[PDB]
Amino acid sequence: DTNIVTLTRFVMEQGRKARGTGEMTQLLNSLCTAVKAISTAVRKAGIAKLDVLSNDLVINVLKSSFATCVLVTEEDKNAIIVEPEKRGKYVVCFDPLDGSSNIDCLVSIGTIFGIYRKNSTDEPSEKDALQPGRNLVAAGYALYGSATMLVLAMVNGVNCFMLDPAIGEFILVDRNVKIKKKGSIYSINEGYAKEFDPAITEYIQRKKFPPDNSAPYGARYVGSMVADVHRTLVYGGIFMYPANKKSPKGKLRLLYECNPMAYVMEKAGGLATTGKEAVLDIVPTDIHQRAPIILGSPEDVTELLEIYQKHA
Amino acid sequence: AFDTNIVTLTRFVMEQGRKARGTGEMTQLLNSLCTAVKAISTAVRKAGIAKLDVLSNDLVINVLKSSFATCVLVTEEDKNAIIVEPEKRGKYVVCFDPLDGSSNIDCLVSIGTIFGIYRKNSTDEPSEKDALQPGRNLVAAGYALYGSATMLVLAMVNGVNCFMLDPAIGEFILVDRNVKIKKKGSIYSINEGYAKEFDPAITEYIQRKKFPPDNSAPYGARYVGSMVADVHRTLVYGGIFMYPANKKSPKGKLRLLYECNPMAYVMEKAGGLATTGKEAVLDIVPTDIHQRAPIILGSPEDVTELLEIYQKHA
Amino acid sequence: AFDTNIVTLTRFVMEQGRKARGTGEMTQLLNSLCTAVKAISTAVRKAGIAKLDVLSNDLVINVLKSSFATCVLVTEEDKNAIIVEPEKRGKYVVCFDPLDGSSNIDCLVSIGTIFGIYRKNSTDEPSEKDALQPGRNLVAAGYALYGSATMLVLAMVNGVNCFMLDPAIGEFILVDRNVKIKKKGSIYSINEGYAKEFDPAITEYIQRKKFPPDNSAPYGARYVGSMVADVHRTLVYGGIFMYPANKKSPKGKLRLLYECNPMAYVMEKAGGLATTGKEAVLDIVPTDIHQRAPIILGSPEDVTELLEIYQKHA
Amino acid sequence: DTNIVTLTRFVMEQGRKARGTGEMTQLLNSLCTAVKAISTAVRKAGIAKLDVLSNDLVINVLKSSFATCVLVTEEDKNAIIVEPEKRGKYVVCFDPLDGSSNIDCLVSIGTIFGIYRKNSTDEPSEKDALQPGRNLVAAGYALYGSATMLVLAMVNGVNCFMLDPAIGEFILVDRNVKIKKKGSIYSINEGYAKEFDPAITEYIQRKKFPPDNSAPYGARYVGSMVADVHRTLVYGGIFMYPANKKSPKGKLRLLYECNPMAYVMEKAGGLATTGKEAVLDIVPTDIHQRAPIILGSPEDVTELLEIYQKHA
Ligand SMILES: O=P(O)(O)OC[C@@H]1O[C@H](COP(=O)(O)O)[C@@H](O)[C@@H]1O
Ligand SMILES: O=P(O)(O)OC[C@@H]1O[C@H](COP(=O)(O)O)[C@@H](O)[C@@H]1O
């Protein structure tokens, strides 16, 4: 296409409006390079762990960005503090590559990231990453399925870019995404049926055997958080990974899995609650803490939230 | 890196269908399916930047004809099974669903091109009867999955071999020989939105997987909601996949001819059963090319743990 | 865009070598040359980010063997013509230069894989004698060029067809049917560094192109210095390409077997002459697989404007 | 590769040292996108003028860069003045796609560009592009052959990046390039033999029939200025497109063909003269004016330059 709106033409053009320095653009342009390379690695990761190439790749692209200063990765015990020569104003938490076990079965997998601004004056530290999700300035994920997709939610909107492999560019395809109010799909690992709390297990029922002699909801669960969330965003519906007895605090880690999706979700007009509070309003105490997550089309998540304090 | 001895699926079917002296007709039919499968992957990868199943149907048909190895073709997307013109004829009957999941592209879920192949068992002029053979008479079946990679799985009489597209040289390269499914699994895949309409045999089974009586751990639910995807996760990780019938789709949803059957063949050559619930899917005599069938496939000790339950109900 | 009726060279040679009833053996040999040609293009494109001709030699040989359509193979890079093992034999003799220009990669000049093919004309056990046939007995010759595109040119008995690699679906797609060279040209291509050692026939000709006596405009000099490149610019734009002999390379530089001959065949099927200077390159009886020959190819009215001059000197 | 040095990681990292604004990086990152897309267009421009897609593409990427303000293209009668909303400090002259007729014969073709800094205070104008080549701050070319190559010469050096099609990134492969002093190749269209001036036609002789009973030079002429120049830079030698009677002012246009190559050449230690003066020292009077060009390994160009005033 001639006037190809790249992700970069787009992030640089909205960045100009903050009367800024250019680091968001640098950040994202460098992140994009980790994403292409991981997409390429996964499109032939069967012709002859991966997590780590993907990981070392993302730290690398992001140090060199000259836009980072704290980096919180799924894979490292401690946060990574960017060397001074190369420090900048942003904080990025990220899961580099999600559902890596699911690549043997050819499950659509992805990289999820959340960017914060270091607002305080002292030496960069974990504390700076201990901000509530509400506070994020940018988030999204890159999906690796039939096509490689980058959904990017910033203050102005949630947008979708698809990588065009012919030119090695991410191109803008869906603009200012909004989720459907109510929709026909619930998504949850029904294998934990004996584990679930009553609120959920009533709701499941209400969708299979709908009291108003209606059409039941369909069941979906790819088992790769990014595929299910991206489905919930484009087609509407709900996704749940509620706490259960195998995992009372939730499974999906907060800083790099829940809070990005949550942000992307609310920015399109969905909700994401733990059933007891907004995901984005949680103040993290540990950079590796988990959360319950119910996200999706408002009326449904709501239908659930009422069932929560219809059972309170 | 850069490898002088690549196994393209052309070379590998040529070492099945040539030591067997069969003229390697098969090979040019399979080669041709690869050109089609490859173009559907490209188009899909750039999907959202450029119906797709009509055009993939037209594609598959055109390449198929030109293999000079077909006489009848059945599509999901076509009424009358296409009797190949004479000039280009050959002995095989190919059955196919060119773009399985056409809906699911929008949500970026893996989808695929399934295919079944027969050999015409008659001395005559082709007709869709030449196609109405059961699975036990399939010479080869397979499918190509458009996932985070484009993997072709091809099962002939020896067993199943996966092949994966190396997008750089554009050849399906061999990555797994003589595949055998896990014997028992830990995943049941089924659309529980239909909970209500399930026949009791199925329903007792879902509760036996969720709430094991013999105090093990509950099976993990999965369900991409794309047949290609759920079969393949079943083939490699084991697991049971069930699309039984309900009343809404009273004799099930999946067409026998080019869905339940090519899968069920791939399945059984890998040590996996495949049944309707009463009889095996590979022995039903097929009467309408678009005749539907229930199908339960996957690891033998689960298909069986469910057939007992089905037997225990009639 | 996205086209349901693609002409892959597999489909096109199958409509030359099948209406002719010849078993389409040829086709699996050509198919196999495409896997090799494709991997050499990828490796070359990423060249400077990862000998290449040894590995392309090993590649071509391996794919070749596995077509089950060869019995003798000659390489530029090998001494003894490779007599294919029995299990995998077939009737063709293939002659090749797997990576012509191995030197020139460094300077990013287009280079290519040339090939000549024969049919074994004997009732025996293969030997490099089965290879020592002249060009008039070539069943098909071609070359693939690794340029700004990867174009395969294939000339069989009907004429020449160019094919170009569509890197997305990874298939050589047909782009020019039954090619015919320009009759007269305006380009002479030759390494004038060798000015001094040129035989007088050649020298009078270079002055006739630079300084036309019959007051036209001077021919444009060209010369990539890669045989594949200069032949192809000659094939399409016309022009005369000359690597005559000098004393330094006293019976010329280009090996007959798999350089002068496959080119000269491609050339003549496109209405272009090809000679050593005395005799046509396609009728020399080949005695050593590495036997060299001068070659002048290109548009007929120029080859001729030079053969007159050669005749006028002896 | 994990720590993949992209062209952008490289231009941003040396740009930081000018204590700058970030426009060189923006400029080049946007130019790179026109180059990938033209490379892709040419690698299948036979499966079914081009100049113009290539052209409109480059203007577009470069307006949107927010780094341009005057653009001088081979293809436009007048310079292009970047709209204010989008103007920046740089001036780019470029031939978008060179030797377009040569794509039918599969000749290695390319895009050549030269970047200037607008130093004056008034409305951007042609005059700003009327600077001597000496003055350039950045130049190079992108080659489209077996591989797509981007040679980029800035104040610190001439460097070579090759596009890795697997990731859509230009990666750095040759560092701080230097040409060989003397070498074995002359390159010139010998078809103009009756046209050439004595200086040249003596030199040609001296190389074919070398007076010191030496090895003669080899002849090369791909007929696509970028392939011949890139050969002359990597392997050493000389390239000439001298003035002749069909073209007394030279053929190769100055602002966008001669002066970039010339700059790249001198930065690697070669020379480029018109036989009567340095190419880079010419002060252009018209943005479309041509030059004689002799560039290459010093001793040879010199051997020629002496023959020039051995004949003066
Ligand atoms: O290893 P990751 O990156 O944490 O990815 C696995 C995640 O963990 C979940 C697995 O939970 P289940 O037990 O419900 O399968 C998946 O849905 C998510 O993708
Ligand atoms: O429309 P297709 O190409 O037949 O593919 C969709 C199929 O139809 C099923 C959908 O059934 P549900 O009603 O359970 O979603 C999928 O599982 C299968 O892939």
Ligand SMILES: O=P(O)(O)OC[C@@H]1O[C@H](COP(=O)(O)O)[C@@H](O)[C@@H]1O
């Ligand atoms: O080394 P190769 O693979 O034989 O290729 C080089 C060939 O050798 C010739 C070089 O001859 P010059 O001495 O005239 O350069 C080229 O024109 C041909 O392509």
Ligand SMILES: O=P(O)(O)OC[C@@H]1O[C@H](COP(=O)(O)O)[C@@H](O)[C@@H]1O
């Ligand atoms: O059309 P462009 O971009 O100007 O490219 C053609 C150029 O013009 C020269 C042609 O000159 P000759 O007359 O010597 O072929 C080529 O060498 C150069 O690439």
Ligand SMILES: [Mn+2]
């Ligand atoms: Mn992960």
Ligand SMILES: [Mn+2]
């Ligand atoms: Mn994770």
Ligand SMILES: [Mn+2]
């Ligand atoms: Mn379908």
Ligand SMILES: [Mn+2]
């Ligand atoms: Mn179907």
Ligand SMILES: [Mn+2]
């Ligand atoms: Mn060679």
Ligand SMILES: [Mn+2]
């Ligand atoms: Mn050679």
Ligand SMILES: [Mn+2]
């Ligand atoms: Mn041009």
Ligand SMILES: [Mn+2]
């Ligand atoms: Mn030009």
